[PDB]
Amino acid sequence: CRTSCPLALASYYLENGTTLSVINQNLNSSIAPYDQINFDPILRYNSNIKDKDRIQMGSRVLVPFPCECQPGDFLGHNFSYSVRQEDTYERVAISNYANLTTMESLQARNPFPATNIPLSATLNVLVNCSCGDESVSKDFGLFVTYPLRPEDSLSSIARSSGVSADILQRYNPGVNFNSGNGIVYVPGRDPNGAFPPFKS
Ligand SMILES: *[C@@H]1O[C@H](CO)[C@@H](O[C@@H]2O[C@H](CO)[C@@H](O[C@@H]3O[C@H](CO[C@@H]4O[C@H](CO)[C@@H](O)[C@H](O)[C@@H]4O)[C@@H](O)[C@H](O[C@H]4O[C@H](CO)[C@@H](O)[C@H](O)[C@@H]4O)[C@@H]3O)[C@H](O)[C@H]2NC(C)=O)[C@H](O)[C@H]1NC(C)=O
Ligand SMILES: CC(=O)N[C@@H]1[C@@H](O)[C@H](O[C@@H]2O[C@H](CO)[C@@H](O[C@@H]3O[C@H](CO)[C@@H](O[C@@H]4O[C@H](CO)[C@@H](O)[C@H](O)[C@H]4NC(C)=O)[C@H](O)[C@H]3NC(C)=O)[C@H](O)[C@H]2NC(C)=O)[C@@H](CO)O[C@H]1O
Ligand SMILES: *[C@@H]1O[C@H](CO)[C@@H](O[C@@H]2O[C@H](CO)[C@@H](O)[C@H](O)[C@H]2NC(C)=O)[C@H](O)[C@H]1NC(C)=O
Ligand SMILES: *[C@@H]1O[C@H](CO)[C@@H](O[C@@H]2O[C@H](CO)[C@@H](O)[C@H](O)[C@H]2NC(C)=O)[C@H](O)[C@H]1NC(C)=O
Ligand SMILES: *[C@@H]1O[C@H](CO)[C@@H](O[C@@H]2O[C@H](CO)[C@@H](O)[C@H](O)[C@H]2NC(C)=O)[C@H](O)[C@H]1NC(C)=O
């Protein structure tokens, strides 16, 4: 890959009861190790969360994760997911991983037929990321993998992210931010609120 970076952030939208523990379990990694006790690696990136044990539906939780060159020369990370009763590839993508992955991607990279994913199977779950693009800007080197929802628009994301609309669009060329689906990459902040710069 032409770029590299020490981490990316995943934007996980909260609905139907999701808890911080489930997020940390599903998105467990070396960068956010799940031990059920210490959620600091996640909470550092979400200073808005008042109570880690009662999180608020309708908000998004930012989760740090490793961003690695994948075969095929693109950036992403393989999470691991332990299958539970009634899980399906569709549900795992749209609910368990909050559209950070797709059902097609899960089906392609796991060997279980859709109608018989065994209990306690592990799935390999790919979530893509970005380390930035020097030709767009030197100012950003940390990116949020952001699944779009019907309520988002380019102006609404520019407003909340603190990044100009033109810059967001250039990082995501040709992509309609009002389309209500798919992902865009949005520059993100360190735990102290600063944007880490691009690093070649
Ligand atoms: C994320 O998780 C996925 C799935 O587990 C991993 O995918 C595996 O990646 C490895 C490479 O690191 C794959 O092994 C390599 O297979 C090569 C053959 O592949 C082409 O694949 C395309 C489609 O993807 C096909 O169309 C072609 O027909 C080919 O098959 C093979 O050439 C290669 O050989 C070499 O490298 C190894 C070292 O890894 C040497 O030991 C060896 O001598 C040789 O030079 C590999 O065997 C593997 O097949 C993938 N597994 C699956 C299930 O797809 C990613 O690697 C994970 N990401 C990270 C960062 O680890
Ligand atoms: C892409 C996509 O998401 N497609 C959806 C389909 O996946 C979905 O079909 C349902 O898929 C699930 C997941 O594979 C499937 O559930 C599995 O069912 C088998 C039984 O057939 C279970 O295996 C048994 O478990 C018991 C223990 O509980 C064992 O005692 C027994 O030996 C096992 N049987 C066999 C033969 O191995 C799996 O445990 C179970 N997996 C999970 C994770 O629950 C459903 O059966 C599928 N249902 C149908 C109707 O095919 C489909 C649902 O409509 O929707 C698609 O969109
Ligand atoms: C979360 O994911 C990490 C990274 O894959 C897992 O890391 C392993 O942890 C054990 C025990 O500490 C080590 O011996 C292994 O070497 C680690 N593996 C790797 C590849 O780094 C960790 O186990 C995961 N946690 C859970 C609960 O699954
Ligand atoms: C992931 O995207 C899916 C598809 O848009 C979302 O599910 C849809 O949600 C709408 C309301 O937002 C429902 O009317 C549809 O029935 C849902 N479609 C499907 C396929 O179930 C889903 O909410 C998104 N996940 C998250 C966590 O935001
Ligand atoms: C992560 O990015 C890769 C590379 O763009 C995507 O892989 C492409 O996916 C499409 C649609 O399924 C396939 O037609 C291509 O064959 C894939 N290309 C390569 C190089 O593998 C992948 O879909 C993205 N992953 C997710 C979960 O969005």
From Swiss-Prot:
Organism taxonomic ancestry: Eukaryota, Viridiplantae, Streptophyta, Embryophyta, Tracheophyta
Primary gene name: CERK1
Localization of this protein: Cell membrane
Residues the entry annotates as binding chitin: Q85, E86, D87, T88, Y89, E90, R91, P113, A114, T115, N116, I117, P118, L119
Name listed for the protein in its UniProt record: Chitin elicitor receptor kinase 1
Induction line: Induced upon treatment with chitin oligosaccharide elicitor and flagellin (e.g. flg22).
Part of the full-length chain shown: 25 to 224 of 617
Tissue-level expression: Expressed ubiquitously, with lowest expression in pollen.
Stretches assigned to the Extracellular side: 1-200
Residue positions with a glycan: N16, N28, N78, N99, N128
